[PDB]
Design a protein around this nucleic acid. Sequence first.
DNA 1: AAATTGCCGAAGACGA
DNA 2: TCGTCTTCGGCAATT
Length: 353
Amino acid sequence: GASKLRAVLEKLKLSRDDISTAAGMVNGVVDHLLRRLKCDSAFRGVGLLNTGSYYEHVKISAPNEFDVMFKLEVPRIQLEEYSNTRAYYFVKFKPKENPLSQFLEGEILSASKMLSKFRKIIKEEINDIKDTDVIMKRKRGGSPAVTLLISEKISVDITLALESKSSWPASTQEGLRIQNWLSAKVRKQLRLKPFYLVPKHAKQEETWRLSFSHIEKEILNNHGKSKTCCENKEEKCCRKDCLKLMKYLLEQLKERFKDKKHLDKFSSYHVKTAFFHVCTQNPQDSQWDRKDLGLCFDNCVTYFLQCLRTEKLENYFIPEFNLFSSNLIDKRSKEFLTKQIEYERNNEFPVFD
DNA sequence: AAATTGCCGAAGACGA
DNA sequence: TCGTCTTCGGCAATT
Ligand SMILES: [Zn+2]
């Protein structure tokens, strides 16, 4: 119900004072790390790309989780697709002229060699600061590479990335289906921007996975079919509101069933990816009228349920990369989430209060 | 030679 | 329903 849902969105609004505090802590530590990394021959060309919910303005409840990408401008990359996985590649170069040659294993760029020096440099620099601790972010395949905890309150996931300015790989050719929503001219402009490669095992070599975090952020902050969508109060859509509610639904279910582990692998990236597909299905701003919040939220819920039931959630940029494949998420986990979402919807989402 | 810096203003919280 | 205030993405000017 649009009124229950509005009340939920109000309780989810971030406090401006907390934003100021958290951003001050995060920026101070991040600036410290970039300064250090720029002094190193290997990470000379590093730069900051802020990613994810906080910088997309769909962070809910508290600004206590930040995603950060340290991207390296590298000479022209030559990619070799790993197996036929569409998203995972070996990185080669087209060595005297490049500072990453210390990480070559033959012609192949070693993600783990690069990750190891990156983590070592950050871990040493984090001891040089106070109220900040490193954790080597589990496996994660390598991305994020490290997780910082600042004064036991704010988490910073740091991802190492390579920036390529070459044309996007062929597996993206049919992705980013925004032509009838954001326009063909905007799709052409986005695909002229760089793409990123982050260190990531495929189910286990020296592979990198394609990343488009910067495009996802650009779409979210310029998200209407109308150029003026959300710029003035009389043209406010409920797109970001629906994404926030989807994220809260998943977060609340993962907390509710934290002792059962079925929901551990579902992520905000899944919810955001599904949301972009609903945007492609509903391209007009009038299909996201603020008066229709309950209806629009239900489109998001329904599409997400169809993804779970069919075990199919395409990466928005790489359509043959299935985020919900059996290899990645057990059927029983998808089944359990379906059951709980259907229950919640049938009972006016008790998990929201 | 090329990485750093300061400024702009849109986005979004918030109080009258 | 407004003005106000703070943060962040981009880049010319700076160094
Ligand atoms: Zn809008």
